[PDB]
Ligand SMILES: [Cl-]
């Protein structure tokens with residue numbers, strides 16, 4: 001039998017990560033026919049947020065691509081990516097990722113058995129709730145789901161909101177049932193998971209980045225013969241490039257599809273409104289500056305300019 005390579009993730013198929021994973025499957029099976037096959041498991045059908053990294057290290061799955069927010073059990077260094085309003089836009093994110101500090105972060109978990117293979121984009125996060133979030137005061141007392149990140153919890157603490165860490169697979173139902181008031185996510189996730197059907201208002205805040213690290217286990221990666229590993233790595237690189245293109249396309253397409261539905265009201269921030277949000281969030285950077293490194297924050301800030 002060909003060696004089966006399993007790739008699990010938590011998103012819908014028709015998304016940047018969903019498409020990256022399928023492109024990787026296509027390229028491996030084209031270039032190494034009969035030698036390797038890639039099985040892709042979207043929508044948390046095999047492993048979900050809470051168990052995927054444990055599964056990876058057990059070699060129950062060979063590739064995963066978690067949000068950069070979801071690595072705190074293995075390193076505190078990736079917390080930089082969660083800081084609110086650190087990056088102006090995806091161009092700045094990419095520059096930071098491709099610079100020396102960003103490249104070094106790919107190896108931040110290597111002694112824990114996790115090999116960083118590349119960064120894959122999704123997009124900037126927007127707030128949703130059942131009220132406009134024009135100013136920080138509008139979030140006070142509201143319950144927001146967050147990815148399992150202390151930085152993201154602190155982001156909501158900073159405005160007197162109540163953060164709740166929950167796996168991605170639960171978010172739609174939590175919103176639907178009003179167990180939570182709101183959440184934060186990209187247009188692509190908001191559209192593909194139908195969050196906009198159970199939230200009356202989406203505020204275009206662009207207040208943080210949701211990106212991924214594509215990872216494998218050291219044990220699996222070392223178990224490959226070097227020539228086959230090189231072919232697999234090149235296929236992965238090409239799949240990430242395609243996924244990044246899709247990410248940018250979906251960010252525009254899916255915003256428009258949400259607007260077309262007329263089910264959720266878009267809320268835009270004035271410059272002064274945005275600045276109020278920026279200012280109230282800066283203390284989150286101060287809370288984490290030691291763990292993350294002042295030097296690393298400064299490298300990220302400089303990537304904007
Ligand atoms: Cl885990």
Ligand SMILES: [Cl-]
Pocket residue numbers: 163164165166
């Ligand atoms: Cl929590």
